[PDB]
Coordinates of C-alpha atoms and ligand atoms in Angstrom, one line a residue:
X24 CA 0.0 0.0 0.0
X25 CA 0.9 3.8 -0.1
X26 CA 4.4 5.0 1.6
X27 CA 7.1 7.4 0.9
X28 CA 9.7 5.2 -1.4
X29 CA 10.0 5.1 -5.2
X30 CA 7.7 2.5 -5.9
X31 CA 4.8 3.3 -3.2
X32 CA 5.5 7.0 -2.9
X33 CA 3.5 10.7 -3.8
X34 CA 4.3 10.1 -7.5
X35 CA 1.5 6.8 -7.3
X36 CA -0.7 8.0 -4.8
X37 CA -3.0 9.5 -7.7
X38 CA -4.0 5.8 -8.8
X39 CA -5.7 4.5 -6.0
X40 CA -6.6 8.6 -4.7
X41 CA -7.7 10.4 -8.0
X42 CA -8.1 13.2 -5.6
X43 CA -4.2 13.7 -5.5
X44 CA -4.4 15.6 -8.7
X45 CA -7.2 18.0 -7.2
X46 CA -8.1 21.8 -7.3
X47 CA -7.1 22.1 -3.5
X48 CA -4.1 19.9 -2.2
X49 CA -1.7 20.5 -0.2
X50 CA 0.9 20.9 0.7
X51 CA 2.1 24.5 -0.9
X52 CA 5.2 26.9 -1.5
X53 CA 4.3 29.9 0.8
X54 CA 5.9 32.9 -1.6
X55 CA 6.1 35.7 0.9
X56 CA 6.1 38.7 -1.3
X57 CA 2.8 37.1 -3.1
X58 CA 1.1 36.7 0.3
X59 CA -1.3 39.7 1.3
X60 CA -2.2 40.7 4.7
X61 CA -5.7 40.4 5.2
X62 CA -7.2 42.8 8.3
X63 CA -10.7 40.9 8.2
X64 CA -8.9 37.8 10.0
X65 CA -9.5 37.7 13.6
X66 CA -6.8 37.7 16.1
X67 CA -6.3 34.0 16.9
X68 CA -7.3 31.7 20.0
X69 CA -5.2 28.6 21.3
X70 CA -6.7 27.4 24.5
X71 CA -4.6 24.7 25.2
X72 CA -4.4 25.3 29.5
X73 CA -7.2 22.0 29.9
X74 CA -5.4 19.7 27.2
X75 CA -5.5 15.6 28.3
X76 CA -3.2 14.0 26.1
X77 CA -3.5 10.0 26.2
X78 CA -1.2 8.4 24.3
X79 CA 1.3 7.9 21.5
X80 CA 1.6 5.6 18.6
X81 CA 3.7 4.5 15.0
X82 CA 1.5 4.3 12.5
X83 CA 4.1 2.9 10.0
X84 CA 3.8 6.8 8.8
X85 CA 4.8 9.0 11.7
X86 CA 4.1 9.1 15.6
X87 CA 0.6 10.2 16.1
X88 CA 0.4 12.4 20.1
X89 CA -3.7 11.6 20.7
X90 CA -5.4 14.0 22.8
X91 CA -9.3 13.4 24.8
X92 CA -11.3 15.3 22.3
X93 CA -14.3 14.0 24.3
X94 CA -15.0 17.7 25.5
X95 CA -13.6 21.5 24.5
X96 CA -10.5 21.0 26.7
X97 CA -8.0 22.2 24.2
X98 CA -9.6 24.5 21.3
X99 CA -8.2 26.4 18.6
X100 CA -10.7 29.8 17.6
X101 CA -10.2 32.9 16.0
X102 CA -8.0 33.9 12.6
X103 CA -10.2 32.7 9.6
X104 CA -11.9 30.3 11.5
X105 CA -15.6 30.5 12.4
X106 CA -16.7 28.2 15.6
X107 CA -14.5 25.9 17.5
X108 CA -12.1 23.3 16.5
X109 CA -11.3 20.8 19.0
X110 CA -7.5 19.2 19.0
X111 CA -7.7 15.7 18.0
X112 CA -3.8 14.6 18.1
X113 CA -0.6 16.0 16.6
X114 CA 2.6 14.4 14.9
X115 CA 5.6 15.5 12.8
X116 CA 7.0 15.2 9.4
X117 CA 10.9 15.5 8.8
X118 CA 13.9 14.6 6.7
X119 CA 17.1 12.4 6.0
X120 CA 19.2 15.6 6.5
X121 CA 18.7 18.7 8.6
X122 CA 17.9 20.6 4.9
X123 CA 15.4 19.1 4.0
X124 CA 11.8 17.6 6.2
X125 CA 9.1 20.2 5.7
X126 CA 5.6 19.5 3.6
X127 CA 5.1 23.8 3.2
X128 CA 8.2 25.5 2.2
X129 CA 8.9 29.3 2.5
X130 CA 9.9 31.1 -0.6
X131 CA 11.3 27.8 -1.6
X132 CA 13.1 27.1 1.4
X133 CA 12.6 23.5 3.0
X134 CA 13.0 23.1 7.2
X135 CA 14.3 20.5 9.0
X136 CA 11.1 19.2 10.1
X137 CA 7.3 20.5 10.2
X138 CA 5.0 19.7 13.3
X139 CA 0.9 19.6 12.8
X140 CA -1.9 20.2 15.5
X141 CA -5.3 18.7 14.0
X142 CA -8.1 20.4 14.8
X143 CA -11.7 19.1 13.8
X144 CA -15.0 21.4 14.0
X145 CA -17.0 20.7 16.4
X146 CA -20.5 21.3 14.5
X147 CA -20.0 18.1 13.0
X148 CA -20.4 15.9 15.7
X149 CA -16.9 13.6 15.2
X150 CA -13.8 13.4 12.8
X151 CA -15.3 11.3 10.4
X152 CA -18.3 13.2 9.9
X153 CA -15.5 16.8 9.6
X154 CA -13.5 15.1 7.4
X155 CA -16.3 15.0 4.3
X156 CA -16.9 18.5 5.1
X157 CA -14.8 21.6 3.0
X158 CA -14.2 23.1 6.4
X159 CA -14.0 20.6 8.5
X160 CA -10.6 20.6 9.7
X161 CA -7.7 23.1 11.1
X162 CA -4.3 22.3 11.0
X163 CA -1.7 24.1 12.7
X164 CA 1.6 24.0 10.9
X165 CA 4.7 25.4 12.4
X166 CA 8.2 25.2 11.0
X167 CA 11.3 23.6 13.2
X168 CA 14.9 24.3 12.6
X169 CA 18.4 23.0 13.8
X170 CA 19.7 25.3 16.7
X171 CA 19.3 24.9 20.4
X172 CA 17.2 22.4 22.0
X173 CA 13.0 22.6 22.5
X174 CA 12.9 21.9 26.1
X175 CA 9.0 21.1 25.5
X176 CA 10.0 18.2 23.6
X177 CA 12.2 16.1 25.2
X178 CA 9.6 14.3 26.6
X179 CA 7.9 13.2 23.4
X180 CA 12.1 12.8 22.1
X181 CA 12.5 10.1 25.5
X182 CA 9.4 8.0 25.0
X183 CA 10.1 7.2 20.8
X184 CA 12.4 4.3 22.2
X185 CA 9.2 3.1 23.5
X186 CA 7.6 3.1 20.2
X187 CA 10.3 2.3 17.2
X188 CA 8.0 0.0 15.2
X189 CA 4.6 0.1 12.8
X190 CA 1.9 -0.4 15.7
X191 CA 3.6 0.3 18.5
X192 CA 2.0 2.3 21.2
X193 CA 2.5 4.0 24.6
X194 CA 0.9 6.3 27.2
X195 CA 1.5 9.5 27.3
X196 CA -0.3 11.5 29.4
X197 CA 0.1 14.9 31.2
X198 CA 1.9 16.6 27.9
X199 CA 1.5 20.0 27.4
X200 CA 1.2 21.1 24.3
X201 CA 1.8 24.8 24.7
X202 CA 5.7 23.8 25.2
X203 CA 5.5 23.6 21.7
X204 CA 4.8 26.9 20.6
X205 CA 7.2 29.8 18.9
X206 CA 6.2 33.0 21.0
X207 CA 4.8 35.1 18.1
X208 CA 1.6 33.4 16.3
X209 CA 1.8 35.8 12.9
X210 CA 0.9 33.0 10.5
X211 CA -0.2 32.8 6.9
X212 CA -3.4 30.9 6.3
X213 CA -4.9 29.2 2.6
X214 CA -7.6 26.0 2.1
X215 CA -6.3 22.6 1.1
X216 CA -5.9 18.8 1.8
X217 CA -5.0 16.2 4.2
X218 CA -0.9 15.4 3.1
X219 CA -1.6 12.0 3.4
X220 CA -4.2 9.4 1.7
X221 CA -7.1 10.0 1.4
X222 CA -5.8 13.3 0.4
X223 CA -9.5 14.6 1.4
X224 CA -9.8 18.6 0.5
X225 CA -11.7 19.2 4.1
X226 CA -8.6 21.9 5.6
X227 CA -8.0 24.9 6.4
X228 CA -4.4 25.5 6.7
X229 CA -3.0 28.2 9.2
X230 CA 1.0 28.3 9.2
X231 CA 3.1 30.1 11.6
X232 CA 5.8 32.4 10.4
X233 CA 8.0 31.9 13.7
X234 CA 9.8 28.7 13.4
X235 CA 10.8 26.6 16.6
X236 CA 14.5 25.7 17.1
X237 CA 15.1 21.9 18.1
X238 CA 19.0 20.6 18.8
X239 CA 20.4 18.2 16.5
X240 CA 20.8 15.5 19.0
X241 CA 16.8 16.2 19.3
X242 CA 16.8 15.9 15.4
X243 CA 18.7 12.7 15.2
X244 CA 16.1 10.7 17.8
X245 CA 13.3 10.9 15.5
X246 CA 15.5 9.4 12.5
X247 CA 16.0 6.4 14.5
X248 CA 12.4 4.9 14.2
X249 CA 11.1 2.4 11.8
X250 CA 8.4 2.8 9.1
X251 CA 8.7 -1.6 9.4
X252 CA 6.7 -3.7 11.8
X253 CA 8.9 -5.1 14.9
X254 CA 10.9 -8.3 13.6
X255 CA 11.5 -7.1 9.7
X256 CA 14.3 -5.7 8.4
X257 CA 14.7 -2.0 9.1
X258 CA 13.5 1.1 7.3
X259 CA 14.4 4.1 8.9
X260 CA 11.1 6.8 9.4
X261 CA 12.8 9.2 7.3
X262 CA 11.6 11.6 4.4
X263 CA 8.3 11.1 5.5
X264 CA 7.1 14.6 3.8
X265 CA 5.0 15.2 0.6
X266 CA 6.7 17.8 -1.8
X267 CA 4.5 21.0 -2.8
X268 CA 1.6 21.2 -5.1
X269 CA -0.3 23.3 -8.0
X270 CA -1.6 26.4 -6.0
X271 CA -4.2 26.1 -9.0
X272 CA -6.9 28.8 -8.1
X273 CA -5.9 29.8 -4.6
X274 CA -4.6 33.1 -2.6
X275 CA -2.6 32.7 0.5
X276 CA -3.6 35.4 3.0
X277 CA -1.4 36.8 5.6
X278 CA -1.8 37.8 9.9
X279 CA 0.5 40.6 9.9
X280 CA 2.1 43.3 7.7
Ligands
5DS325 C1 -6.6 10.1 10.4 N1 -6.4 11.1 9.3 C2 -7.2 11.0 8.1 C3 -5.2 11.7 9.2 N2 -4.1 11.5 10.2 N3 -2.9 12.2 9.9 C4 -3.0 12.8 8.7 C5 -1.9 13.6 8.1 N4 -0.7 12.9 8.3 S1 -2.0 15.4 7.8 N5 -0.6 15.7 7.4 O1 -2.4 16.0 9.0 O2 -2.8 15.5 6.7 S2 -4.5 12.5 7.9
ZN326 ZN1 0.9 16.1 8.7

């Protein structure tokens, strides 16, 4: 089935997901100078201060971090969102080499890795109902780079030893996700896709301009785990990132000037 190498990979995604070649996928290049600031967005709301994370898992894609989304404990409002979004679970995508890793890239420019909160709205019941809906979702996307450490993410960086292998799962509870955050949230904000089958055109996008430093020993963690199942020769979770798409008939808007 679908995966990130040269016979499984984004390039042959379109023949079982027709969508792939869609009017609204993501992810995109984010050309700054093309971007324009937009005063009808709202100012932006993450009320993360009652978050219950639960648990982590491999996937055999990335490390999904699942949150209680039984309740509005941790919400994301505001910006060019209308209603409430309720945080379902975050993960990361990343590279081989510091270089490269990020889905969005900035005027071109790839980051070492990109890390997404998912956010579904709340007037649709559950995920699976938001999902078949044009905005049903909010992602949060922001950029990380190789400097000095994130000391909000050595926790999830000590626990992946725990998890190496497709299927593999472990609790995780009592994370706080604002540890996460850059301290500005200017962001740019555009509608498009899930990044992964079934490529569903349900998002809206909102990217932050600020991106989080991470150390390289930090970095070098996540390239140890497996896309294999425990007991088969290894694959190391790397490259897990799908390259930018056709913009097609879409304008990316801008928080600040
Ligand atoms: C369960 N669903 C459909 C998803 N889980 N993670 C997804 C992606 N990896 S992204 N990048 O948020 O579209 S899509
Ligand atoms: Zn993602």
């Amino acid at each position: 089935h679908w995966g990130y190498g040269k016979h499984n990979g984004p390039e042959h995604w379109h023949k079982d997901f027709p969508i792939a070649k869609g009017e609204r996928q993501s992810p995109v290049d984010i050309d700054t100078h093309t971007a324009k600031y937009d005063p009808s967005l709202k100012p932006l709301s993450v009320s993360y201060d009652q978050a219950t994370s639960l648990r982590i898992l491999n996937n055999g894609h990335a490390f999904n971090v699942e949150f209680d989304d039984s309740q509005d404990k941790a919400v994301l409002k505001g910006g060019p969102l209308d209603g409430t979004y309720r945080l379902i679970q975050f993960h990361f995508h990343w590279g081989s080499l510091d270089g490269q890793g990020s889905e969005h890239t900035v005027d071109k420019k790839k980051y070492a890795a990109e890390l997404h909160l998912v956010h579904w709205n709340t007037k649709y019941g559950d995920f699976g109902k938001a999902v078949q809906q044009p905005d049903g979702l909010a992602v949060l996307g922001i950029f990380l780079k190789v400097g000095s450490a994130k000391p909000g993410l050595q926790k999830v960086v000590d626990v992946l030893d725990s998890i190496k292998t497709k299927g593999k799962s472990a609790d995780f509870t009592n994370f706080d996700p604002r540890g996460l955050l850059p301290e500005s949230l200017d962001y740019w904000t555009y509608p498009g896709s899930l990044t992964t089958p079934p490529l569903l055109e349900c998002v809206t996008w909102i990217v932050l301009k600020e991106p989080i430093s991470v150390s390289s020993e930090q970095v070098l963690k996540f390239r140890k785990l497996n896309f294999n199942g425990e007991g088969e020769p290894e694959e190391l979770m790397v490259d897990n990132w799908r390259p930018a798409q056709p913009l097609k008939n879409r304008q990316i808007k801008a928080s600040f000037k």
